[PDB]
Protein backbone atom coordinates (compact mmCIF):
# COMPACT_ATOMS: atom_id res chain seq x y z
CA UNK A 1 0.00 0.00 0.00
CA UNK A 2 2.33 2.72 1.25
CA UNK A 3 6.10 2.23 0.23
CA UNK A 4 8.25 2.57 2.90
CA UNK A 5 11.97 3.60 1.83
CA UNK A 6 15.44 3.95 4.05
CA UNK A 7 18.73 4.57 2.91
CA UNK A 8 20.35 2.29 0.64
CA UNK A 9 23.64 2.44 2.18
CA UNK A 10 25.97 4.82 4.94
CA UNK A 11 29.53 4.33 5.95
CA UNK A 12 30.85 5.61 9.47
CA UNK A 13 33.47 5.21 11.51
CA UNK A 14 33.88 3.52 14.91
CA UNK A 15 32.83 5.75 18.24
CA UNK A 16 30.19 7.71 15.76
CA UNK A 17 26.68 8.41 16.22
CA UNK A 18 24.71 7.20 13.25
CA UNK A 19 21.33 7.58 12.41
CA UNK A 20 19.63 5.70 9.93
CA UNK A 21 15.82 6.99 8.46
CA UNK A 22 12.73 5.10 7.27
CA UNK A 23 10.10 6.54 5.67
CA UNK A 24 5.94 6.46 4.61
CA UNK A 25 5.21 7.41 1.27
CA UNK A 26 2.16 8.74 2.61
CA UNK A 27 4.65 11.87 4.14
CA UNK A 28 4.68 10.86 7.89
CA UNK A 29 5.40 8.03 10.37
CA UNK A 30 2.96 8.38 13.42
CA UNK A 31 3.37 6.40 16.51
CA UNK A 32 0.43 4.45 15.59
CA UNK A 33 2.47 3.01 12.72
CA UNK A 34 4.75 1.06 15.56
CA UNK A 35 7.87 0.82 13.37
CA UNK A 36 10.27 -1.50 13.99
CA UNK A 37 14.23 -2.42 13.05
CA UNK A 38 15.45 -5.56 12.94
CA UNK A 39 19.36 -6.43 11.72
CA UNK A 40 20.52 -8.96 9.54
CA UNK A 41 23.70 -10.59 9.99
CA UNK A 42 25.54 -12.98 7.68
CA UNK A 43 23.90 -16.16 7.26
CA UNK A 44 20.33 -14.99 7.55
CA UNK A 45 20.97 -14.12 11.11
CA UNK A 46 18.08 -12.06 11.87
CA UNK A 47 18.13 -10.27 15.51
CA UNK A 48 14.73 -7.83 16.58
CA UNK A 49 16.46 -4.59 17.88
CA UNK A 50 13.66 -2.04 18.00
CA UNK A 51 9.83 -2.71 18.39
CA UNK A 52 7.50 0.09 18.73
CA UNK A 53 9.11 2.88 17.52
CA UNK A 54 11.32 3.32 21.12
CA UNK A 55 10.84 -0.02 22.87
CA UNK A 56 14.69 -2.31 22.53
CA UNK A 57 13.87 -5.34 22.25
CA UNK A 58 15.46 -8.32 25.06
CA UNK A 59 19.14 -8.07 24.85
CA UNK A 60 19.59 -5.29 22.86
CA UNK A 61 22.64 -2.84 23.55
CA UNK A 62 22.13 0.10 25.15
CA UNK A 63 23.61 2.23 21.96
CA UNK A 64 20.61 1.65 20.42
CA UNK A 65 17.62 3.93 19.99
CA UNK A 66 14.37 4.39 18.50
CA UNK A 67 12.54 7.73 17.92
CA UNK A 68 10.47 9.68 15.64
CA UNK A 69 12.33 12.44 13.98
CA UNK A 70 10.27 15.49 12.50
CA UNK A 71 8.27 12.90 9.31
CA UNK A 72 10.80 9.70 9.83
CA UNK A 73 11.28 7.19 12.05
CA UNK A 74 15.40 6.97 13.30
CA UNK A 75 17.37 4.56 14.43
CA UNK A 76 20.20 5.78 16.08
CA UNK A 77 23.59 3.98 17.11
CA UNK A 78 25.12 6.45 19.71
CA UNK A 79 28.87 5.15 19.32
CA UNK A 80 29.33 2.26 16.13
CA UNK A 81 31.44 -0.53 16.76
CA UNK A 82 32.39 -2.89 14.16
CA UNK A 83 30.02 -5.36 15.27
CA UNK A 84 27.57 -3.11 13.83
CA UNK A 85 28.48 -3.66 10.32
CA UNK A 86 24.64 -4.91 9.33
CA UNK A 87 21.80 -4.73 6.92
CA UNK A 88 19.03 -3.03 9.04
CA UNK A 89 15.30 -3.27 7.91
CA UNK A 90 12.53 -0.70 9.10
CA UNK A 91 9.19 -1.93 8.85
CA UNK A 92 5.75 0.10 9.61
CA UNK A 93 2.37 -1.42 10.59
CA UNK A 94 0.61 0.55 7.74
CA UNK A 95 -3.60 -0.57 7.05
CA UNK A 96 -3.58 -3.75 9.05
CA UNK A 97 0.02 -4.93 6.76
CA UNK A 98 3.90 -4.87 8.26
CA UNK A 99 5.35 -3.08 5.03
CA UNK A 100 9.22 -3.34 4.94
CA UNK A 101 11.62 -0.44 3.82
CA UNK A 102 14.45 -2.13 1.67
CA UNK A 103 17.07 -2.27 4.33
CA UNK A 104 20.44 -0.18 4.74
CA UNK A 105 23.41 -1.88 4.90
CA UNK A 106 25.91 -0.07 7.38
CA UNK A 107 29.42 0.09 6.44
CA UNK A 108 31.72 0.96 9.73
CA UNK A 109 35.73 1.75 8.96
CA UNK A 110 38.56 -0.41 10.37
CA UNK A 111 39.23 -3.60 11.09
CA UNK A 112 18.45 -18.94 28.22
CA UNK B 1 14.96 -20.44 27.12
CA UNK B 2 12.84 -18.85 23.99
CA UNK B 3 13.25 -21.47 20.89
CA UNK B 4 11.22 -20.88 17.69
CA UNK B 5 12.28 -24.12 15.88
CA UNK B 6 11.09 -24.77 11.87
CA UNK B 7 10.74 -27.65 9.56
CA UNK B 8 13.42 -28.80 7.02
CA UNK B 9 14.17 -27.61 3.38
CA UNK B 10 11.37 -28.17 0.86
CA UNK B 11 11.26 -29.00 -2.76
CA UNK B 12 8.11 -28.89 -4.63
CA UNK B 13 6.77 -28.65 -7.86
CA UNK B 14 4.32 -25.89 -9.17
CA UNK B 15 1.06 -26.28 -8.54
CA UNK B 16 1.50 -28.47 -5.47
CA UNK B 17 0.83 -27.08 -1.73
CA UNK B 18 3.24 -27.33 1.09
CA UNK B 19 2.98 -27.24 4.88
CA UNK B 20 5.67 -25.58 6.74
CA UNK B 21 5.60 -25.23 10.78
CA UNK B 22 7.50 -23.69 13.76
CA UNK B 23 7.41 -25.11 17.45
CA UNK B 24 7.85 -22.58 19.80
CA UNK B 25 9.48 -23.66 23.14
CA UNK B 26 10.50 -21.55 26.14
CA UNK B 27 7.35 -19.02 26.57
CA UNK B 28 3.43 -19.39 27.08
CA UNK B 29 2.61 -19.60 23.09
CA UNK B 30 -0.80 -18.51 23.65
CA UNK B 31 0.73 -14.75 24.96
CA UNK B 32 2.82 -13.62 21.79
CA UNK B 33 1.59 -13.63 17.99
CA UNK B 34 3.03 -15.79 15.30
CA UNK B 35 4.76 -13.96 11.98
CA UNK B 36 5.40 -15.76 8.76
CA UNK B 37 8.29 -13.15 6.64
CA UNK B 38 9.43 -14.34 3.46
CA UNK B 39 12.32 -13.04 1.98
CA UNK B 40 13.67 -13.75 -1.31
CA UNK B 41 17.16 -12.80 -2.27
CA UNK B 42 16.93 -9.20 -4.11
CA UNK B 43 13.69 -8.74 -3.33
CA UNK B 44 14.25 -8.31 0.20
CA UNK B 45 11.28 -8.99 3.14
CA UNK B 46 7.72 -9.42 2.96
CA UNK B 47 4.96 -10.03 5.53
CA UNK B 48 2.75 -12.92 4.82
CA UNK B 49 0.63 -13.05 8.00
CA UNK B 50 -0.02 -13.18 11.77
CA UNK B 51 -1.59 -15.75 14.05
CA UNK B 52 -2.39 -15.01 18.08
CA UNK B 53 -2.59 -18.54 19.05
CA UNK B 54 -4.66 -17.34 22.58
CA UNK B 55 -8.09 -16.64 20.03
CA UNK B 56 -7.30 -17.88 16.57
CA UNK B 57 -7.14 -13.92 15.29
CA UNK B 58 -5.39 -13.60 12.11
CA UNK B 59 -4.21 -11.22 9.87
CA UNK B 60 -3.12 -11.57 6.41
CA UNK B 61 -1.27 -9.94 4.14
CA UNK B 62 -3.95 -9.10 0.91
CA UNK B 63 -1.32 -10.32 -1.64
CA UNK B 64 -1.41 -13.55 -0.03
CA UNK B 65 -5.00 -14.41 1.33
CA UNK B 66 -6.13 -16.73 -1.20
CA UNK B 67 -3.21 -18.69 -1.06
CA UNK B 68 -2.29 -19.30 2.23
CA UNK B 69 -3.90 -20.69 5.71
CA UNK B 70 -2.06 -20.16 9.17
CA UNK B 71 -3.17 -22.58 12.06
CA UNK B 72 -1.52 -23.06 15.69
CA UNK B 73 -1.93 -26.40 17.93
CA UNK B 74 -1.68 -24.81 21.52
CA UNK B 75 -1.61 -28.28 22.84
CA UNK B 76 1.94 -28.57 20.73
CA UNK B 77 2.93 -25.14 20.58
CA UNK B 78 3.46 -25.31 17.02
CA UNK B 79 2.49 -22.55 14.17
CA UNK B 80 1.46 -23.73 10.58
CA UNK B 81 1.62 -22.13 7.27
CA UNK B 82 0.01 -23.59 4.12
CA UNK B 83 0.23 -22.07 0.94
CA UNK B 84 -0.74 -23.63 -2.22
CA UNK B 85 -0.68 -22.52 -6.10
CA UNK B 86 2.94 -22.74 -5.65
CA UNK B 87 5.18 -20.97 -8.69
CA UNK B 88 8.85 -20.17 -8.92
CA UNK B 89 7.85 -16.80 -7.13
CA UNK B 90 7.60 -18.42 -3.88
CA UNK B 91 10.93 -20.04 -3.73
CA UNK B 92 12.48 -17.96 -0.98
CA UNK B 93 13.42 -18.64 2.73
CA UNK B 94 10.64 -18.65 5.26
CA UNK B 95 10.75 -17.50 8.48
CA UNK B 96 8.89 -17.78 11.81
CA UNK B 97 9.00 -14.68 14.28
CA UNK B 98 7.63 -14.08 17.70
CA UNK B 99 5.31 -11.00 18.00
CA UNK B 100 3.15 -8.85 20.91
CA UNK B 101 1.98 -5.38 20.69
CA UNK B 102 3.85 -3.10 18.73
CA UNK B 103 6.15 -5.36 17.18
CA UNK B 104 6.46 -8.53 14.75
CA UNK B 105 9.85 -10.45 15.58
CA UNK B 106 11.85 -10.26 18.44
CA UNK B 107 12.94 -13.09 18.20
CA UNK B 108 13.33 -15.06 14.67
CA UNK B 109 13.26 -18.45 13.62
CA UNK B 110 16.49 -19.72 11.47
CA UNK B 111 14.71 -20.01 8.11
CA UNK B 112 12.88 -22.61 6.03
CA UNK B 113 14.01 -22.58 2.68
CA UNK B 114 11.37 -23.37 -0.20
CA UNK B 115 12.29 -24.27 -3.93
CA UNK B 116 9.60 -24.60 -6.72
CA UNK B 117 10.90 -26.25 -10.01
C1 LIG C 1 -6.41 -8.26 18.41
O1 LIG C 1 -5.21 -7.60 18.00
C2 LIG C 1 -5.26 -6.20 17.78
O2 LIG C 1 -5.29 -5.48 19.01
C3 LIG C 1 -4.20 -5.68 19.91
C4 LIG C 1 -4.55 -4.94 21.20
O3 LIG C 1 -4.64 -3.53 20.93
C5 LIG C 1 -2.90 -5.25 19.21
O4 LIG C 1 -1.79 -5.52 20.04
C6 LIG C 1 -2.76 -5.98 17.86
O5 LIG C 1 -1.65 -5.41 17.13
C7 LIG C 1 -0.44 -6.20 17.12
O6 LIG C 1 -0.59 -7.36 16.32
C8 LIG C 1 -0.74 -7.13 14.91
C9 LIG C 1 -0.84 -8.49 14.19
C10 LIG C 1 0.48 -6.34 14.42
O7 LIG C 1 1.68 -7.09 14.64
C11 LIG C 1 0.54 -5.00 15.17
C12 LIG C 1 0.69 -5.31 16.66
O8 LIG C 1 0.62 -4.12 17.42
C13 LIG C 1 -4.01 -5.83 17.01
O9 LIG C 1 -4.14 -4.47 16.62
C14 LIG C 1 -4.67 -4.30 15.30
O10 LIG C 1 -6.09 -4.50 15.31
C15 LIG C 1 -6.84 -3.47 15.98
C16 LIG C 1 -8.34 -3.82 15.99
O11 LIG C 1 -8.62 -4.77 17.03
C17 LIG C 1 -6.55 -2.14 15.23
O12 LIG C 1 -6.83 -2.27 13.84
C18 LIG C 1 -5.06 -1.80 15.36
O13 LIG C 1 -4.73 -0.65 14.61
C19 LIG C 1 -4.24 -2.94 14.82
O14 LIG C 1 -2.94 -2.70 15.26
Known amino acids: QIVVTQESALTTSPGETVTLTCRSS?????????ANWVQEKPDHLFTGLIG???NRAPGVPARFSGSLIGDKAALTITGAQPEDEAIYFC?????????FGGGTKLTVLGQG | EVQVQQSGTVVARPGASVKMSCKAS????????MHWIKQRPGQGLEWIGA????????FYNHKFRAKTKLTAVTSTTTAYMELSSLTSEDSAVYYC???????????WGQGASLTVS
Open chain 2, 97 to 107: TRGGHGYYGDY
Open chain 2, 26 to 33: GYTFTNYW
Open chain 2, 51 to 58: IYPGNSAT
Open chain 1, 26 to 34: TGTVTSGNH
Open chain 1, 52 to 54: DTN
Open chain 1, 91 to 99: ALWSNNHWI
